[PDB]
Amino acid sequence: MVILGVGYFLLGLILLYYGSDWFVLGSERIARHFNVSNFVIGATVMAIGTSLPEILTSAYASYMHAPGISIGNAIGSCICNIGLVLGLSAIISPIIVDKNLQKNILVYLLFVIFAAVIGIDGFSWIDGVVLLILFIIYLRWTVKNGSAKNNPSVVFSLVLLIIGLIGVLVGAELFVDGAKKIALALDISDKVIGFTLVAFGTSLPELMVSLAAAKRNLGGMVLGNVIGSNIADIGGALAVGSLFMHLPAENVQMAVLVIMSLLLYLFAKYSKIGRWQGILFLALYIIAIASLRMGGG
Numbered sequence: 001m002v003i004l005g006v007g008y009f010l011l012g013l014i015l016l017y018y019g020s021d022w023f024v025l026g027s028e029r030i031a032r033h034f035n036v037s038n039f040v041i042g043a044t045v046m047a048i049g050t051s052l053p054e055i056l057t058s059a060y061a062s063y064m065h066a067p068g069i070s071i072g073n074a075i076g077s078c079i080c081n082i083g084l085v086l087g088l089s090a091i092i093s094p095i096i097v098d099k100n101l102q103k104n105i106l107v108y109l110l111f112v113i114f115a116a117v118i119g120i121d122g123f124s125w126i127d128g129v130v131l132l133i134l135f136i137i138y139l140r141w142t143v144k145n146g147s148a149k150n151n152p153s154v155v156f157s158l159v160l161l162i163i164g165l166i167g168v169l170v171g172a173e174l175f176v177d178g179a180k181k182i183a184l185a186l187d188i189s190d191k192v193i194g195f196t197l198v199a200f201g202t203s204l205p206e207l208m209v210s211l212a213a214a215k216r217n218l219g220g221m222v223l224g225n226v227i228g229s230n231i232a233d234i235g236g237a238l239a240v241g242s243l244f245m246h247l248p249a250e251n252v253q254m255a256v257l258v259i260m261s262l263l264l265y266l267f268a269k270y271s272k273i274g275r276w277q278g279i280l281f282l283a284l285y286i287i288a289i290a291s292l293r294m295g296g297g
């Protein structure tokens with residue numbers, strides 16, 4: 001039982017580690033095949049693939065009458081993706097953002113501010129429908145602007161991508177299930193801590209994929225994955241949750257998100273996303289986890 005937990009834990013870590021690199025390599029190849037930028041592949045295929053855990057979690061939680069967990073997971077993930085994921089990644093591989101990606105980030109910022117505003121009194125199912133529609137438009141707009149028989153180069157590419165994605169998603173699940181089994185076996189299971197960590201657990205794919213990308217200096221892919229994941233978590237995970245039940249307001253977390261998103265845009269536009277910017281993101285992340293209410297909603 002503690003043995004099984006340790007086996008899942010370790011296997012999960014292995015699958016996350018190697019799976020992330022395969023997903024990155026396959027995604028980079030696919031980008032070249034389709035003549036799109038790494039940012040575009042990161043913001044679309046990679047972002048959505050890695051946000052499948054958030055979407056399922058938020059949908060399930062709300063369906064099970066825990067809308068606090070549903071929104072806690074969605075917004076907590078966005079904060080994790082900028083504070084921790086981008087923070088670490090930026091230190092590993094500093095990013096200078098080109099003029100067109102800057103505009104994509106501005107659109108992201110507007111979307112986040114829009115979500116925060118309509119969310120002041122919580123999120124209804126109509127809020128969800130709107131955010132989902134905007135999410136779809138964002139994807140199509142992003143692909144438009146970043147764009148332009150059986151081929152073994154392409155097949156290998158898709159295999160790498162899909163197997164890598166399977167690897168990170170199964171890996172994250174095993175890692176989390178393993179941790180939970182260990183905690184249970186050692187009699188240190190704590191529901192409040194567990195729910196606090198939901199958003200982190202679902203963000204393990206984003207974390208490992210972004211670190212793998214950063215190690216290969218694929219800065220545009222890192223940024224696309226972070227920006228795209230946050231949009232997927234709001235227009236997808238949060239939105240779907242709101243379809244099952246009204247989601248209670250999280251005004252403090254949304255304000256933290258808006259502040260981090262604003263900083264991300266300002267750095268992108270006027271500076272770079274490098275070592276000191278990453279240090280700041282991590283510092284804000286650490287302050288957030290030190291001070292935000294526990295329980296994940």
Ligand SMILES: CCCCCCCC/C=C\CCCCCCCC(=O)OC[C@H](O)CO
Pocket residue numbers: 110111113114117118119121124127
């Ligand atoms: C298309 C590009 C050009 C246009 C860009 C526009 C960007 C707007 C984003 C933030 C400003 C505030 C938007 C505020 C919308 C508030 C709606 C509202 O008050 O809704 C209340 C309802 O209860 C909620 O569920």
Ligand SMILES: CCCCCCCC/C=C\CCCCCCCC(=O)OC[C@H](O)CO
Pocket residue numbers: 107108110111114118124126127130134135137138
């Ligand atoms: C992805 C590209 C767009 C990124 C974002 C750009 C700004 C969008 C801002 C306003 C238009 C919003 C949709 C049309 C107006 C909806 C107003 C509203 O409040 O919708 C929910 C409703 O309040 C619930 O009761």
Ligand SMILES: CCCCCCCC/C=C\CCCCCCCC(=O)OC[C@H](O)CO
Pocket residue numbers: 175176179180183188189190191192193194195197198200201
């Ligand atoms: C502190 C080291 C964390 C290490 C990395 C894994 C983080 C994700 C693990 C559980 C989150 C989702 C749990 C949903 C169920 C929680 C059930 C619960 O009570 O778990 C409490 C236990 O304390 C949990 O270790």
Ligand SMILES: CCCCCCCC/C=C\CCCCCCCC(=O)OC[C@H](O)CO
Pocket residue numbers: 013017076077079080084196197198199200201289
């Ligand atoms: C070969 C293995 C290479 C591994 C490389 C690992 C890099 C890990 C980065 C941070 C660890 C964070 C540990 C604690 C994680 C949960 C933190 C938390 O409090 O999450 C709250 C919320 O759910 C979300 O913000």
Ligand SMILES: CCCCCCCCCCCCCCC
Pocket residue numbers: 048136139140143236240
């Ligand atoms: C023009 C290329 C992109 C076309 C639109 C792709 C839309 C993909 C939407 C995925 C949505 C996942 C969450 C659904 C609730």
Ligand SMILES: CCCCCCCCCCCCCCC
Pocket residue numbers: 113116117120251252254255258
């Ligand atoms: C640019 C507007 C951002 C709003 C960001 C989220 C927080 C709104 C906080 C409102 C605080 C007072 C609430 C009274 C119910």
Ligand SMILES: CCCCCCCCCCCCCCC
Pocket residue numbers: 091092279282283286
């Ligand atoms: C490749 C050289 C990397 C040097 C990285 C220094 C990283 C410092 C991270 C500090 C995080 C601080 C959070 C508040 C204490």
Ligand SMILES: [Ca+2]
Pocket residue numbers: 050051052053054202203204205206
């Ligand atoms: Ca995720």
Ligand SMILES: [Ca+2]
Pocket residue numbers: 118119120121122123124127
């Ligand atoms: Ca609302």
Ligand code: NA
Pocket residue numbers: 046047048049050051052206225228229230232
């Ligand atoms: Na994602």
Ligand code: NA
Pocket residue numbers: 054073076077078080198199200201202203204
């Ligand atoms: Na998450």
Ligand code: NA
Pocket residue numbers: 050051054077078081202203206229230233
């Ligand atoms: Na995410």
